[PDB]
Every structure is written in structure tokens, then in C-alpha cells.
Design an enzyme around this catalytic site. Structure first.
Site, short mmCIF file in Angstrom:
data_model
loop_
_atom_site.label_atom_id
_atom_site.label_comp_id
_atom_site.label_asym_id
_atom_site.label_seq_id
_atom_site.Cartn_x
_atom_site.Cartn_y
_atom_site.Cartn_z
N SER A 1 62.77 -16.16 52.91
CA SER A 1 61.52 -15.41 53.13
C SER A 1 61.71 -14.06 53.81
CB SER A 1 60.51 -16.25 53.93
OG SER A 1 61.10 -16.98 55.01
N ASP B 1 56.39 -22.89 52.91
CA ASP B 1 57.57 -22.73 52.08
C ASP B 1 58.59 -23.86 52.28
OD1 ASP B 1 57.24 -19.91 50.85
OD2 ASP B 1 56.84 -19.55 53.00
N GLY C 1 63.55 -11.64 53.40
CA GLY C 1 64.86 -11.00 53.37
C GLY C 1 66.08 -11.73 52.83
N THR C 2 67.26 -11.26 53.24
CA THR C 2 68.55 -11.73 52.71
C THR C 2 69.50 -12.35 53.76
OG1 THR C 2 68.39 -9.92 51.11
CG2 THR C 2 70.51 -11.12 51.27
#
Lengths: 251, 257
Positions: B24, B133, B26-27
Site C-alpha cells: 500500500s 487490505d 509504495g514499494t
């Protein structure tokens, strides 16, 4: 008894990593970080030892160090752990962006390792970015040369047949690894049918498009690459030339 | 005592290593501080005074939410870009164990994983945070064998205005849909499979209309009936018919006895 065997429960097996030649690679702990390939019955065990003997003897800074083996709970080859994982992983999975200097250094070190193996008359048979590993201290370590006695790297004469492997087919495979280094891509990425790739490369009508290499790829590296990928195997350079050429163009 | 600036990890103390995947906002990368850490590079390189303050507010929240079964927030980075740093889980995700390396868990371990995940969700909900999520991909396994949930942060920002875990009414986020997702995590645990594994676009339509739902016949033979009941409760198509996590945790606490 055997010095080089690790006793059951002396190795903690950790995360499954994937399958390389002949087995499944795990992260593991043996007095430190290690890598463990679980291999896929006496007589066979003795043949395995004969291989261990050979493995214990091929040592170079740019190939994985053999550290020991297990028999129980399973056949296992233990080598050092490479935190940088594989070249394949960096290029085609996590899409790491290497500087041209790091790429040419990686190409140099792989060439040193291959030079060592070939001077010992060892044929790899499976050189590819999947088993070119990057160690925490920034050196390259080659794997999967063991147990001597993926189509994207097979020279045309290797594809169409029958123990066709040779020194010159290794050089081809390295040529493909240069393609990966200099284009950040797998060859033939625009063709979806692995069977059409096999046939067309086997006939000599299909080969990597060297025009997809990055702009800053030095002219000699492109030249070297095209040589290594030469379809007529006896027209390919040997690794002492290849290493010599890369040593110099880096200067 | 501490304030926002305090929670910055000084530049160059973290070596960012291997890229792991995307979570969520980003990386995710592996990284090294005084030890192993995980680093989420957020996908925002130039923060405006409102976005940066929004980031401060979320960090403000992350610092107050602590449970043994959710990821510890360790600090944030500034260069080259905003990043959230948490602890490293050598066991990677539940998903990777069940569906990638196809690890085989005993029934007792499968249920302790469920209990620990439930302990974590219970805390988040008791702190009024909705995950939104939850899936086996961001349920992580720490080396010490404790479960750590992730991707619960930046809850408010998610609010501003992967399919296998969405409640039918979600195909609208609430505690009740988090409970739904947890139900699919039970399905993954007890069947060793992802739901709807035999269908290769139709799912959005059929689960949303209630004509498609997970095949409960794939759960292990030695899977307790209470676990089946709970699982079926959590997966109810009508959201108000689902249990709350205190109830969910209690039921799992007991059948674990």
C-alpha cells in the site's frame, strides 16, 4: 565417517528460494548464513561422493565455495550465501538499475570465473543469469557448474540436439548474459512461443537483436557480444580472449 | 516526549538492498540498519506542506499503535524519498508459504497462525483502525515464529476519495469487511488453497451478486467443526451477519484449547 558431511540437525533450513539445476535452493544457517540445494540408496551415494571430491577442488574467487553436504535428512550441497541474490533477479524481476560500470564489472568477474573453469577443462552446460550470483561484498559468484558428470542461452548447435555441450557453447551462453547486461532484457521477449524460439534459433534464423542495447554500451562490448553469439562455434572466442578484451575495454 | 523529527532515521544509516514487491502507497525493499529492516519507499517524491503534514499525522498514529502481532514502526527516511521503516520478517508472508513455496503446516500451527492474526486484528479494531487490505500477502512471519500484520498504516489517507479477499458488498469498507477478508485467510489456512482456484473477471460479477462463493469442501479432514462454523460466519454474504473480532478471537482461543 566423513570430514565434509554435515550431521542431521546441524543445519537449519530457512526460506525456500527456488529450483536450480537438480534441486531446490534454500536459505540456511550453518555457523552463519548459507545456501542449501536439496538434491532430487548406496551406490548412488558413492557416485555423489566422487562428485563432492571434484567440487572440493574447484576453487576460485568468482565461483561459489563448496562448504559441505548432507545425506540426511536429504542430499544437500551447501555453499556460501549471496545476499545480492542472482543477476536474473536484479535485471528481470526487481529491475535494478545498475551503472554501466557495475555491469561491465559484473561481466568482467563472470568472465574470470568462466576463465578459471575452462582452464580446468570444466564445461558449465548451464551458464545463465539465474546462477550468476552477487555476494554482499560485491563480487560475482557462479553456481550450477557442479554435478557435471533455460533455452534462451543455448547456442544453436545445442538447441537442435545428444550431449552437444562444449567450451564454445559456454561462450555463447555468456554472450547472452552480455545481452542481458547491455540491454536489461531477456532475448526474444517479443516472441511468446518457446517452441518457435527453439526451432528458429536451432536453424540459425533467429538471434538476439543487438540494436536493443543501451546507448552507452561501449563499442568493443557490442563487438565482443556479437563474436560470442557467432553461430559457427569455432568462430567464437575463447575465454582468455574474452577476459582479456573486457579487462582492457574497462580501462 | 518524542516528536516527529525524532523518528527520522538519519541519512546513510540504512542501506537499502533488494526490492521485494509493492504494498500500500509504495514499494518494499529489504534493508540494513543496525540489523535487518523492511523499507517501504512511498510513491511521493515532492511533498507539499499539506501532504507532508498528512505524513506526519500518519506517523503520529503509527507510533501509538503497538501489538506483538502487528509490525513495529521504527522510523522514516527522507532521501531520496519518503519511506517507512519496520522490522524484518525472515519468514516472509503467509501467502508465500501457502501458495509459492507450498510449505506444509500441521493443523496446530495453522490455527496458531489464525489465532495470532486474530489477536492482531482485534487490536487494530479496538483502536478503530480498519485494515481494508487484509490478505495472506501482508500477514508476515517473523523469525521468532510470531505473526506480524502489515499494511494497516496510512488508514486515514486510504480513506481520501487482490480481489480474492473482497467482501461482496465491497465489490463501503468497514470492520465487517475486514472480518470477511479474515474469513478468506481461514479458507487459505484450512484448505491450503486460494478460493475460486478452478476459475480463470467472472469473480467480480458472481461474488458480488452472491452466486459464487468459496468451495468449503476443500478444508482438511482434521479441521475442527468450530473452525468451520467460524469460517462460514466470517464469509457471510450479508455483512451484518458476520461476527466481530472479539467474538472471532474468543472462538479461536477456545478451540485452540
Amino acid at each position: 565417517f566423513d570430514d565434509w558431511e554435515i550431521p542431521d540437525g546441524q543445519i537449519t533450513v530457512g526460506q525456500r528460494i527456488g529450483s536450480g539445476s537438480f534441486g531446490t535452493v534454500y536459505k540456511g544457517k550453518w555457523h552463519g548464513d548459507v545456501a542449501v540445494k536439496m538434491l532430487n540408496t548406496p551406490q548412488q551415494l558413492q557416485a555423489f561422493k566422487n562428485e563432492v571430491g571434484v567440487l572440493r577442488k574447484t576453487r576460485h574467487v568468482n565461483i561459489l565455495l563448496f562448504m559441505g553436504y548432507s545425506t540426511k535428512p536429504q542430499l544437500a550441497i551447501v555453499t556460501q550465501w549471496c545476499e545480492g541474490s542472482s543477476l536474473y533477479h536484479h535485471l528481470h524481476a526487481s529491475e535494478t538499475k545498475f551503472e554501466m560500470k557495475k555491469l561491465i564489472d559484473i561481466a568482467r568477474q563472470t568472465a574470470r570465473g568462466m576463465d578459471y573453469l575452462h582452464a580446468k577443462s570444466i564445461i558449465h552446460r548451464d551458464l545463465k543469469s539465474n546462477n550468476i550470483f552477487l555476494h554482499e561484498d560485491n563480487t560475482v559468484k557462479i553456481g550450477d557448474f557442479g554435478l557435471a558428470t533455460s533455452i534462451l542461452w543455448m547456442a544453436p548447435e545445442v538447441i537442435r540436439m545428444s550431449n552437444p555441450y562444449s567450451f564454445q557453447s559456454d561462450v555463447y551462453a555468456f554472450g547472452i548474459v552480455l545481452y542481458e547486461l547491455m540491454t536489461g532484457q531477456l532475448p526474444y521477449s517479443n516472441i511468446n512461443n518457446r517452441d518457435q524460439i527453439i526451432e528458429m534459433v536451432g536453424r540459425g534464423s533467429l538471434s538476439p537483436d543487438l540494436s536493443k542495447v543501451r546507448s552507452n554500451c561501449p563499442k568493443r562490448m557490442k563487438r565482443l557480444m556479437a563474436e560470442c553469439l557467432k553461430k559457427k562455434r569455432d568462430e567464437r572466442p575463447s575465454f582468455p580472449r574474452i577476459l582479456a578484451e573486457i579487462e582492457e575495454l574497462a580501462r
